[PDB]
Amino acid sequence: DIVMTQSPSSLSASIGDRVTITCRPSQNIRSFLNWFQHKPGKAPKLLIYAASNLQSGVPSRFSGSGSGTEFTLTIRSLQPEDFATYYCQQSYNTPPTFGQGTKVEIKRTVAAPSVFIFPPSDEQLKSGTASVVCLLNNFYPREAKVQWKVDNALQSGNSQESVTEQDSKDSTYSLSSTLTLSKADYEKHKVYACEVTHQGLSSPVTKSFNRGE
Amino acid sequence: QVQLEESGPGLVKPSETLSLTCSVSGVSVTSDIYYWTWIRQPPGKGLEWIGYIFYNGDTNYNPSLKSRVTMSIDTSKNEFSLRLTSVTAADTAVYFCARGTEDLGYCSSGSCPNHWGQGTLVTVSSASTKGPSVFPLAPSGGTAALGCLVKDYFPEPVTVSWNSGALTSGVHTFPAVLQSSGLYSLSSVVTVPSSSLGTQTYICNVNHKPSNTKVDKRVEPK
Amino acid sequence: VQSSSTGKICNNPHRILDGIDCTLIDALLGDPHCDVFQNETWDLFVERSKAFSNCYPYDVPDYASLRSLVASSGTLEFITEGFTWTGVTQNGGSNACKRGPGSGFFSRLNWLTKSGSTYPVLNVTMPNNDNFDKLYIWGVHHPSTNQEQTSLYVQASGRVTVSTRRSQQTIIPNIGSRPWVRGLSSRISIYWTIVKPGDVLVINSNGNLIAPRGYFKMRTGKSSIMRSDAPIDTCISECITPNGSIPNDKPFQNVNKITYGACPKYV
Ligand SMILES: *[C@@H]1O[C@H](CO)[C@@H](O)[C@H](O)[C@H]1NC(C)=O
């Protein structure tokens, strides 16, 4: 019932930079405050206990400070593996409650995506559906625009995108876009193309294939 | 010093009872000083603490859930469990089990879970289970990409390996997308040498536990 | 109704002892940064919200009672006694409780560990041949692992039993990891024993004893303790509240239900 207000909700910082996250409980909680780190697909990890105590295996660049109604987690020189969502947690009265979290993203140099296009497999076409996939691999920053073209007509409404979370070693993103057509419409047209616009490409890049070659 | 593996249905129908189990390795659930906790996080929402249980019988459940939740410890199986009645879509969440150590000098009783499991997703829905169809992504300046498309399954998640956990460097398994049909789809890709396409084996393994499905696709030039 | 305060605690006429960075329990135990308070006395001890511990991680099962008991006594007067601890290593220390550059420990406690390959059954006595009550502070070490327990104490399970002619306490340590506090998953639990004139202290342990070094001289009188962040200044007021001293010419006051001295009634 104690409300934990964490700020900011999100931040981006370069490798080597000093990062600071604040937590303000809705009442004084003395030192009964913990900090958790949650990396994509891993178990949340207690980093700091009782406001300032570093947990085993946590690098000394992480430090917790404060008491009462204002607490700070500092990461003194950000590393790519520190990409995660961080939460404060009060242990002062029941129920334990958590801050809404702070997503820490890493700023790095621009990296152009590598682009790959995959035609639908023949096995799927027997199902009456054709999925065409475009892969944008290992890029930074997150914007990449993927335009589909079928015999040079721009498509809209018949594709979906998915983006990975930032990579824990190189801090890049990857993105898949899937163009879905009925098999009947797919065989009525010939040239299938994925066109990618991104800050790392001086002009857009197109990967394409010819149906039935 | 302890490992914590969560298990349970993955799909529960509305108004029915959600049951989860946590298999504990490395310590005994009969120890006087540890407590066992559940926490949950709805998609895109915050973490919500559910409760704790001690071997001696002492429990405490979040008042938001106390009139619907119970926990138990199974000493014979070295497990502990969560039971949540009369579920709705608000209870769709990743559920984490966790261990803490009673430490009243620094923590309220049962309030500092410090070893967590990785969480298991529970979806509350009337829709039925569906196993994926799995299709290959065949390869076209030195590096080639290939993958497998995992289409039309329900509910989440699927797991993908390449060559049974052997090929691992360079793998990207994308977050699932909800299609307009109400079923999920995702892709898993890997980068490999183009010089490798003529002679070496790649099989994606797509596994979906709610539909008890294992599908192997092998990939190669069209 | 007295409705205003200076916002400052007047240092007269009452003897104020400002805890600054220290709680009274940390001063009692002898947390190194609190050792400046050895043998000090007070009419009113003032604990600050900024106080912190910086020694071996501990809890005190009956915290509030020990704190209240010491606060009312009004002194930290301590007398070292010549306990004899045969067959154990004394004065153990820890990097969780640094004293200067090296490892250390609470100044008033004695971390006993095995000597050579054995930890005997300790059985020591200390009579009270004085005419005042003696306060003994002692503890029990809880190792984080079974390996730690046997490395320190040899026996797989320890026990501490402290008794007088009219009391007895037996504590069994609880082994297991806790979250790291200054690098350590182990803990100490703190206990106390009062020995009346003509009585005797007996300590019996086959492991995990954090021994007393002597006793605190108990007193009776008007001393107490208060939590306040108000600064102290040089001025006179018989009535002290955590908000500051207040005039006491009015029958009632609305400043604070916590008060010390000759004070108006809270309404
Ligand atoms: C221990 O000390 C007490 C007090 O002198 C005595 O009663 C007892 O005989 C001694 N030995 C043992 C093993 O308790």
3-state secondary structure of A156: coil
Cβ(C137)–Cβ(C61) under 8 Å? Answer: no
Scanning every residue of chain C, which has its alpha carbon at the shortest distance from the alpha carbon of A34? Answer: C179
CATH number of the domain where residue A76 is located: 2.60.40.10
Nearest-angstrom CA–CA distance, B131 and C170:
60
Going by DSSP bridges, is the β-strand pair C224-227/C44-47 parallel, antiparallel, or unpaired?
parallel
Same domain, A100 and A162: no
Question: Token digits for A29?
Answer: 């909680």
Distances (CA, A) of C127 to A69, B28, C196: 48, 44, 9
Nearest-angstrom CA–CA distance, C97 and C64:
23
Dihedral angle over CA of B26, B32, B34, B38, nearest 10: 110
Query: Are the Cβ atoms of B103 and C174 closer than 8 angstroms?
Result: no
Question: C198 C-alpha vs ligand 1 centroid, how far in Å?
Answer: 18
Query: Are the Cβ atoms of A117 and B140 closer than 8 angstroms?
Result: yes
Query: Are the Cβ atoms of B174 and A174 closer than 8 angstroms?
Result: yes
Nearest-angstrom CA–CA distance, A156 and B111:
50
- Single-letter amino acid, residue C266: Y
**Residue A80 backbone zone (phi > 0: left; psi -120 to 50: alpha; other: beta):** alpha
Residue C145 Cβ contacting ligand 1 at under 6 Å: no
Going by DSSP bridges, is the β-strand pair B120-124/B11-12 parallel, antiparallel, or unpaired?
parallel
Same domain, A138 and A200: yes
Nearest-angstrom CA–CA distance, B135 and B215:
10
User: For residue C180, which residues of chain A lie inside 8 Å, CB to CB?
Assistant: 49, 53-56
Nearest C-alpha neighbor of C227 from the set B111, A28, A71, A91: A28
- Single-letter amino acid, residue A97: T
Which residue's alpha carbon is nearest to atom 1 within ligand 1? C123
Taken in order of first residue, the domains within chain C and their CATH numbers are 1-14+231-267 (2.10.77.10), 15-230 (3.90.209.20)
User: For residue C59, which residues of chain B lie inside 8 Å, CB to CB?
Assistant: 103-106
Nearest-angstrom CA–CA distance, C189 and A60:
28
Residue C123 Cβ contacting ligand 1 at under 6 Å: yes
Nearest-angstrom CA–CA distance, A108 and A145:
19
> Which residues are registered as beta bridge partners of B115?
B99
Residue with tokens 């940390």: C26
* Residue A16 domain boundaries: 1-107
Q: Among A80, A107, A134, identify where a domain stops.
A: A107
Same domain, A89 and A139: no
Cβ(A141)–Cβ(A184) under 8 Å? Answer: no
| Burial environment of residue C68 by CB neighbours within 10 A (0 to 12, 13 to 18, 19 or more) | middle
Same domain, A21 and A88: yes
**Nearest residue, CB atoms, C181 vs list A28, A46, A50:** A50
A-C CB pairs within 8 A amount to 23
Q: Which residues contact C62 (CB under 8 A, 6 or more apart)?
A: C191, C192
Which residue's alpha carbon is nearest to atom 6 within ligand 1? C123
- Single-letter amino acid, residue C267: V
To the nearest whole Å, the CA of B115 is away from the closest chain C CA by 10
Q: Ligand 1: which of C160, C199, C202 to mutate, judged by most atoms within 8 Å of the beta carbon? A: C202
Nearest-angstrom CA–CA distance, C68 and C136:
15
3-state secondary structure of A65: strand
> Which residues are registered as beta bridge partners of A37?
A45, A86
Nearest C-alpha neighbor of B95 from the set B158, B36, B160: B36
Same domain, A126 and A157: yes
Nearest-angstrom CA–CA distance, C110 and C214:
10
Residue C168 Cβ contacting ligand 1 at under 6 Å: no
CA angle B154–B158–B160, rounded 5-degree value: 155
Cβ(A119)–Cβ(A207) under 8 Å? Answer: no
Question: Token digits for B170?
Answer: 């360079």
Taken in order of first residue, the domains within chain B and their CATH numbers are 1-126 (no CATH), 127-219 (2.60.40.10)
Scanning every residue of chain C, which has its alpha carbon at the shortest distance from the alpha carbon of B100? Answer: C178
Cβ(C120)–Cβ(C206) under 8 Å? Answer: yes
Q: Which residues contact A182 (CB under 8 A, 6 or more apart)?
A: A128, A129, A130
Question: C122 C-alpha vs ligand 1 centroid, how far in Å?
Answer: 10
Distances (CA, A) of B37 to A50, A93, B87, B107, B122: 19, 16, 19, 15, 17
List strand residue ranges (DSSP E) for B69-132, in order: 69-74, 79-84, 93-101, 115-116, 120-124
Nearest-angstrom CA–CA distance, A133 and A99:
38
Same domain, A137 and A161: yes
Question: B73 C-alpha vs ligand 1 centroid, how far in Å?
Answer: 43
Same domain, A114 and A103: no
The backbone torsions φ and ψ at residue B23, rounded to the nearest 5 degrees and listed phi first, read -85, 125
Same domain, A88 and A174: no
Which residue's alpha carbon is nearest to atom 7 within ligand 1? C202
Same domain, A114 and A205: yes
Q: Look at the alpha carbons of C126, C128, C129, C134 in this order and tell me if their dihedral is positive or negative.
A: positive
Question: C123 C-alpha vs ligand 1 centroid, how far in Å?
Answer: 6
Q: Among A85, A107, A129, identify where a domain stops.
A: A107
Instruction: Determine contact: B34 vs chain C, CB below 8 A.
Output: yes
Nearest-angstrom CA–CA distance, A163 and A174:
6
Same domain, A131 and A196: yes
Q: DSSP secondary-structure letter at B77?
A: T
Residue with tokens 């002619």: C165
Shortest-distance atom of ligand 1 to CA C123: 1
Cβ(C115)–Cβ(C36) under 8 Å? Answer: no
Residue C258 Cβ contacting ligand 1 at under 6 Å: no
Q: Which residues contact B93 (CB under 8 A, 6 or more apart)?
A: B40, B41, B42, B43, B45, B48, B121, B122
Residue with tokens 């006993």: C112
Q: Among A107, A142, A164, identify where a domain stops.
A: A107
Q: Look at the alpha carbons of C231, C232, C236, C238 in this order and tell me if their dihedral is positive or negative.
A: positive
Cβ(B5)–Cβ(B38) under 8 Å? Answer: no
Going by DSSP bridges, is the β-strand pair C252-253/C58-59 parallel, antiparallel, or unpaired?
unpaired
3-state secondary structure of B86: coil
| Burial environment of residue B26 by CB neighbours within 10 A (0 to 12, 13 to 18, 19 or more) | exposed
3-state secondary structure of B72: strand
CA angle C176–C192–C194, rounded 5-degree value: 160
What total of structural domains would you count in chain A?
Answer: 2
> Which residues are registered as beta bridge partners of C184?
C181
User: For chain B, how are helix, strand and coil distributed in percent, rounded to 5?
Assistant: 5, 50, 45
Nearest C-alpha neighbor of B196 from the set B216, B162, B220, B172: B220
Question: C65 C-alpha vs ligand 1 centroid, how far in Å?
Answer: 30
Same domain, A5 and A101: yes
Which residue's alpha carbon is nearest to atom 2 within ligand 1? C123
Reported residue count of chain A is 213
Query: Are the Cβ atoms of C177 and B101 closer than 8 angstroms?
Result: yes
Query: Are the Cβ atoms of B1 and C177 closer than 8 angstroms?
Result: yes
Q: Where are the alpha helices (DSSP H) in chain A?
A: 122-125, 183-187
Residue with tokens 């009872």: B17
3-state secondary structure of B69: strand
The backbone torsions φ and ψ at residue C23, rounded to the nearest 5 degrees and listed phi first, read -80, 165
The backbone torsions φ and ψ at residue C61, rounded to the nearest 5 degrees and listed phi first, read -50, -40
| Burial environment of residue A152 by CB neighbours within 10 A (0 to 12, 13 to 18, 19 or more) | exposed
Asked, as a colleague might, if the bond just before B157 is cis with ω within 30 of 0, I would say: yes
Chain B contact probe: residue of C62, C182, C187 with most B CBs at under 10 A: C187
Cβ(B201)–Cβ(B166) under 8 Å? Answer: no
Nearest C-alpha neighbor of C18 from the set C217, C221, C228: C228
Shortest-distance atom of ligand 1 to CA C202: 4
Q: Which residues contact B165 (CB under 8 A, 6 or more apart)?
A: none
- Single-letter amino acid, residue B25: S
What is the H or E stretch that residue A202 is in?
none
DSSP notation for chain C? -B----SSEEEESS-EEE-TT--HHHHHHT-GGGGGGTT-B-SEEEE-TT----SS-EE-TTHHHHHHHHHHHTB--EEE-----TTEE-S--EEEEEETTEEE--TTEEE-EEBTTB---EEEEEE--SSS-EEEEEEEEE-SSHHHHHHHHSSSS--EEEE-SS-EEEE---------BTTBS-EEEEEEEEE-TT-EEEEEESS-EEEE-EEEE---SS-EEEE--PPEEEEE-S-EETTEE---SSSEE-S-S--BSS-PEE-
Reported residue count of chain C is 267
Nearest-angstrom CA–CA distance, A70 and C267:
33
Nearest-angstrom CA–CA distance, C97 and C123:
28
Nearest-angstrom CA–CA distance, C133 and C122:
24
Distances (CA, A) of B167 to B192, B196, B214, C38: 10, 13, 18, 65
Nearest-angstrom CA–CA distance, C264 and C247:
9
3-state secondary structure of B194: helix
Chain C contact probe: residue of B33, B99, B109, B115 with most C CBs at under 10 A: B33
Same domain, A188 and A114: yes
Query: Are the Cβ atoms of A53 and C179 closer than 8 angstroms?
Result: yes
Q: How far is CA C76 from the centre of its chain?
A: 9
Nearest-angstrom CA–CA distance, C73 and C43:
9
